[PDB]
Amino acid sequence: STGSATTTPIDSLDDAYITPVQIGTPAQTLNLDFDTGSSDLWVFSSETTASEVDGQTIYTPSKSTTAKLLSGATWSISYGDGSSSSGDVYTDTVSVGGLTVTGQAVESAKKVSSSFTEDSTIDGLLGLAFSTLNTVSPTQQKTFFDNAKASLDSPVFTADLGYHAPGTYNFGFIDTTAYTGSITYTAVSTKQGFWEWTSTGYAVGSGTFKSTSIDGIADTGTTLLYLPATVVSAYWAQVSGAKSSSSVGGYVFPCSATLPSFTFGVGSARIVIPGDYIDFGPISTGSSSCFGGIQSSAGIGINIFGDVALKAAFVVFNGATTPTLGFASK
Numbered sequence: 001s002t003g004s005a006t007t008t009p010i011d012s013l014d015d016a017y018i019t020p021v022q023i024g025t026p027a028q029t030l031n032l033d034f035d036t037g038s039s040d041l042w043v044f045s046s047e048t049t050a051s052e053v054d055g056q057t058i059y060t061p062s063k064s065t066t067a068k069l070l071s072g073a074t075w076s077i078s079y080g081d082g083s084s085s086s087g088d089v090y091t092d093t094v095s096v097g098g099l100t101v102t103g104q105a106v107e108s109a110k111k112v113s114s115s116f117t118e119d120s121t122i123d124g125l126l127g128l129a130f131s132t133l134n135t136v137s138p139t140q141q142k143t144f145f146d147n148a149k150a151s152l153d154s155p156v157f158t159a160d161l162g163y164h165a166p167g168t169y170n171f172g173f174i175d176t177t178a179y180t181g182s183i184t185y186t187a188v189s190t191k192q193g194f195w196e197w198t199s200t201g202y203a204v205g206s207g208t209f210k211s212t213s214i215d216g217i218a219d220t221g222t223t224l225l226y227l228p229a230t231v232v233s234a235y236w237a238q239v240s241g242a243k244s245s246s247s248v249g250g251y252v253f254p255c256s257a258t259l260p261s262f263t264f265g266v267g268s269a270r271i272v273i274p275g276d277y278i279d280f281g282p283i284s285t286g287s288s289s290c291f292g293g294i295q296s297s298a299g300i301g302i303n304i305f306g307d308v309a310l311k312a313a314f315v316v317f318n319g320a321t322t323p324t325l326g327f328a329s330k
Contacts, residue, residue: 001151002172003099007034007161010121013280014307015223017161018121019169022095023106024064030057030123034169035221036159036195036317037304039133039143040077041094042085042107043124044116052112055120061108067092075107075136080222080300085112089136094144096126099171101148105134105141125221128157128317133193145171145319155319159220160330161311163277179314179328184269188323192302194219195317197325199305200267202227204235205260209270214303218315218325222306224280225262225273226297235262235294242292248283251292255282262294264309266327273312 007019018031023043030043044056061067067090076086087110094104109124116122127134131142149155152172160168160178168178189196194217203209214227232251236242238260242253253259259275278293293308316326 001099001148002153002170003095003097003148004168004170005097006166007169008166009162009164010119012164014162014164014311016119016122017167017220017307018123019096019126021126023059024061024092025066026064027095028057028059028064030059031121032124032126033122033221034128034159035125035219036128037217037219037221038077038079038125039127039129039131039193040075040107040135041105041124041126041144042075042077042087042109044112045087045108047087048109049111052117054117057123059106059108059124061090061092061106064092066102067106070105070136070139073105073136073139073141077135080304081115083113083115085109085116087111089141096144096171097169099148099152101144104144104147105136107136128220129195130190130193132190145317148172149319157317157319159310159315159317161220161307163274163311167311174316179330181329182269183314183316183326183328184266185316185318185324185326186266188325190323195323195325200265202231202265203263203270204238205262205275207238209263209265211265214264216297216303216305218305218310218317220307220310222304223308224304224306225278225294225308226300226304226306227294228303229296229298232294232296235260236292244296248289248291250295252283252289253292255288255290257290264305269327271309271313271327271329273309277308277312
């Protein structure tokens, strides 16, 4: 089997992407944030504290003939940006782009933090990291991908995110029309539960490539590109007037600037992020100070290849016995 679904930016800055997911019988369609940095599929639901719902579409298990309460199971998760959610668990039928899993754990939110409440366009998350990170207790549950794996034509899914435009998540096959040149594969460590790999270096604009190992995670659920302070300083030094602002919370730059590109290494290959991808607009409405899309990972504790980097590439998440990551230009 295979699946194929379109993923769409939630706003004009590509702050996140939502993908339609069918849950239950008859189908209830919710727009979920596919997150390769976590491993819980959770949804706004009929059980969610009413004051904490503001425009989201909710899952109502009592209206699904295939929903079963997973007796005794609960979940609770906190993300790298400080947000959180928690609740109980159902199993139900879940389909993504034509691909169906029966008995998928659907984690029903009783509580969500304010950032989720304020995001009316995101109805929940669908985790695509390794199932070892799943928070369901006392019986840990598998991701949608893990459950589908055996039925897939090939044990892979691919992320093809757009710049200010729709893109695609495919399951079970590699669309050879969706990228240019070849796909370069690189080793993955599953030791922390993430799609963790090592980039072979970087370049700033038309500058020379610096060979240097950068350990990081491929995380579709993170907006920006977070890299070591040395790398990030070298990038923003090429932008007149750019500075790190503790009051704003990172590097800002004059909105009148033309940003240079940023290149990252995948083995001997190179992915080029155009300068425009690194512009996240005025820090506040009407300001002439703009927020940078490349930020320091110092204090996060890990480097994150988020959407800024991933949307410049066609990315293969290979879930073979020995997992690997593939990157191609597009």
